[PDB]
Every structure is written in C-alpha cells, then in structure tokens.
Amino acid sequence: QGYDVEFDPPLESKYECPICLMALREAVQTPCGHRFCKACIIKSIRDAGHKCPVDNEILLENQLFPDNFAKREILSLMVKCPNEGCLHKMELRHLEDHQAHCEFALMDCPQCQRPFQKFHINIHILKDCPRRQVSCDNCAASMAFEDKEIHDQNCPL
C-alpha cells in the first residue's frame, strides 16, 4: 500500500516498506528498529500474528510509533508523475494536488464512456466522436456523428 511511483533518483533501501516493497506510507517504527507502512504492519499483526515479519521478534501495536522523520524525507523526494509523458519531477506530497489537474493524465469521455489525454480529451468530444451529439439541421434531434446520414432518409422534416 506504499507509494507506487517512480522516484527520481530511485528510492533508497531504508525508505522502503519490507511488506509491500514500496515507499513507506505514514511511516511507523518497531522497537526492534524497522520501518513499515502503518496499515501494512497493523494488518501483518492482525493477519500473520503478533510478531515482526522480518526478525520474528514480538511486536506491539501500541509500542509502535510514527517515524515522522522517515515520512518527512520521503514526501520531499522528487517523483515522476505515473501518468504518461511527464518529465518534470515534483515532491511526492504534491503528487496528490498534481493529479487533480494533470494535463498529461487520462480521463474519460462520458459521451461514449472512453478516455483520452487531458490535452486531447475535449478535442475529441467536439469534432471526433462518431457518437458525438450532432443534431440534424431540420429535425433538431440529437443523434450520433456516425448516425447522422441514416436518420435523414426517414427524417421527419
């Protein structure tokens, strides 16, 4: 449940959860000196037993504590946007704000329930969709771009 992104430079060994093999998310530390994602290690105690997965030492959830130093460094490492095309890095904490605007991202066109790229998403909807709502100039009824001719033969004018 770690951050599934491509860090730049690649994520260092000490900033990786041994459970999900990804960057620590809401980092917590065990008394035996090991870092895990909070939900990763709580589930491990809740599923695999009240132990530490690595060293088999007994692990207390209430003796766990938030490693807010590990968390701080990870959220400022330069990450690549997982969506296609982006080549400018950013601090991982801002990746949440980027994906509410990402122009390289991929979002759907509900006129036909289908994705595009954000620089092309609105470009297709208005001149490219075979299912785009283009009404007949005489009947004023919305029908597909690929269905514009078939109406005109039996079009109530």
Q: Which residues bind its own copies (CB under 8 A)?
A: 14, 29-35, 65-73
Placement of tokens 């095309």 in the chain: 85
Residue 69 binds which entry of Zn ion, its own copies, none, with Cβ cut-offs from 5 to 8 Å by kind?
Answer: its own copies
CB atoms within 10 A of CB 139: 13
Q: Which of 68, 70, 93, 66 is nearest to 5 (CA)?
A: 93
Among 8, 55, 108, 149, binds Zn ion (CB under 5 A): 55
In angstroms, the CA 58 to CA 41 distance is: 13
Closest approach of Cβ 9 to Zn ion, in Å? 18
Q: Select from 5-13, 67-75, 89-97, 98-106 the region that touches Zn ion (CB under 5 A).
A: 98-106
48-64: burial string, b at 16+ Cβ within 10 Å, e else: eeeebbeeeeebeeeeb
- Given the rule CB under 5 A, which residues bind Zn ion? 2, 17, 19-20, 30, 32, 34, 37, 40, 52, 54-55, 81, 83, 86, 102, 104, 109, 111-112, 114, 129, 136, 138-139, 151, 155
